[PDB]
Amino acid sequence: GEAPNQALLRILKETEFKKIKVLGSGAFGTVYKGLWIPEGEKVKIPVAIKELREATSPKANKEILDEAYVMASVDNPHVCRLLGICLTSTVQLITQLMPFGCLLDYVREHKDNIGSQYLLNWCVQIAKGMNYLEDRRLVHRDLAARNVLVKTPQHVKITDFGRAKLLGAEEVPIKWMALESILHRIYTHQSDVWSYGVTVWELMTFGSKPYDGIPASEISSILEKGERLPQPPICTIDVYMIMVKCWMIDADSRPKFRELIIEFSKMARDPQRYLVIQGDERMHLMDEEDMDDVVDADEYLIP
Numbered sequence: 001g002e003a004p005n006q007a008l009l010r011i012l013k014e015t016e017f018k019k020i021k022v023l024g025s026g027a028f029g030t031v032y033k034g035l036w037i038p039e040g041e042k043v044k045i046p047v048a049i050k051e052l053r054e055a056t057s058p059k060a061n062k063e064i065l066d067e068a069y070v071m072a073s074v075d076n077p078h079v080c081r082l083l084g085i086c087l088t089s090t091v092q093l094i095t096q097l098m099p100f101g102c103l104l105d106y107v108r109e110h111k112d113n114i115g116s117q118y119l120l121n122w123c124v125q126i127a128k129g130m131n132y133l134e135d136r137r138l139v140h141r142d143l144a145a146r147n148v149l150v151k152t153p154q155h156v157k158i159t160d161f162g163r164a165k166l167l168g169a170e171e172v173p174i175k176w177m178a179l180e181s182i183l184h185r186i187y188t189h190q191s192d193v194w195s196y197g198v199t200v201w202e203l204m205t206f207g208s209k210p211y212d213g214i215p216a217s218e219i220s221s222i223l224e225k226g227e228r229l230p231q232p233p234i235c236t237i238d239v240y241m242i243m244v245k246c247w248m249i250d251a252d253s254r255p256k257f258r259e260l261i262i263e264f265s266k267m268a269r270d271p272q273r274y275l276v277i278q279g280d281e282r283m284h285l286m287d288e289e290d291m292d293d294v295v296d297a298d299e300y301l302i303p
């Protein structure tokens with residue numbers, strides 16, 4: 001039976017926060033960098049503010065609220081933090097600012113400076129995030145490098161709950177999908193594991209596109225034929241065999257997230273044994289003056 005969901009949904013006054021910069025437009029909506037000053041509190045919290053495309057079509061109001069619902073109900077160091085909503089005219093989603101942006105852009109932009117320690121720690125942290133969702137019985141359904149955010153090079157969090165569901169519920173990123181999901185729209189914790197596999201492959205190839213070329217329509221055929229993504233240059237057979245296990249047809253044959261935490265964690269203790277990166281040993285990885293009161297969202301706790 002389902003426990004009552006007692007998450008608090010915080011409604012925020014438009015006056016409590018100043019926008020500052022656009023971060024990402026075009027696609028569907030507009031995300032700004034900003035600072036949130038709660039009521040009378042004397043803290044300023046860096047935040048991202050997702051005020052969706054001006055037009056207020058009741059269709060997409062229903063979709064930003066579902067995210068808010070999910071994000072308000074999660075609480076884990078490796079899942080993105082929702083501060084609250086603003087009901088202005090178009091619904092504003094207010095999350096913790098993740099200054100380094102999405103992990104896909106971050107690996108793409110920084111290939112030459114990314115060591116094995118970072119790559120494997122990311123793997124461990126993503127698997128922790130996903131394991132936590134598994135404990136809350138959430139199937140994410142859209143895990144990808146584009147949907148993991150970077151608070152710092154050493155701390156990432158899963159984002160984009162716009163397709164999350166409870167395991168069992170009944171209510172398209174084809175290249176990240178478990179075969180049962182493309183064929184039967186079955187979606188399980190184990191189909192999230194498939195997508196973890198792809199996300200890891202995106203990281204290990206420093207942001208390549210999976211099945212670059214092959215059009216979406218061909219994908220399910222390819223997999224039934226038994227083809228998978230190729231071994232990235234930097235990966236030992238050890239790392240790659242974990243990817244491949246995530247991509248087994250038998251869903252229950254795939255690893256569990258808790259096993260993934262364990263395995264990458266072992267590897268993270270000796271990173272150079274597991275990823276082979278040219279120049280590994282030597283790699284290493286805001287605004288205004290009134291910054292006395294700045295507090296990261298992670299240090300701003302609410303009773």
Ligand SMILES: Nc1ncnc2c1ncn2[C@@H]1O[C@H](COP(=O)(O)OP(=O)(O)NP(=O)(O)O)[C@@H](O)[C@H]1O
Nearest residue numbers: 024027028029031048095096097098099101102160
């Ligand atoms: N909390 C955040 N902190 C910093 N940057 C963010 C944050 N949320 C989003 N962004 C940036 O804005 C981009 C677009 O945001 P997002 O709304 O996730 O993309 P989208 O294509 O509109 N939908 P989706 O990727 O499915 O969530 C992200 O990839 C980031 O570069």
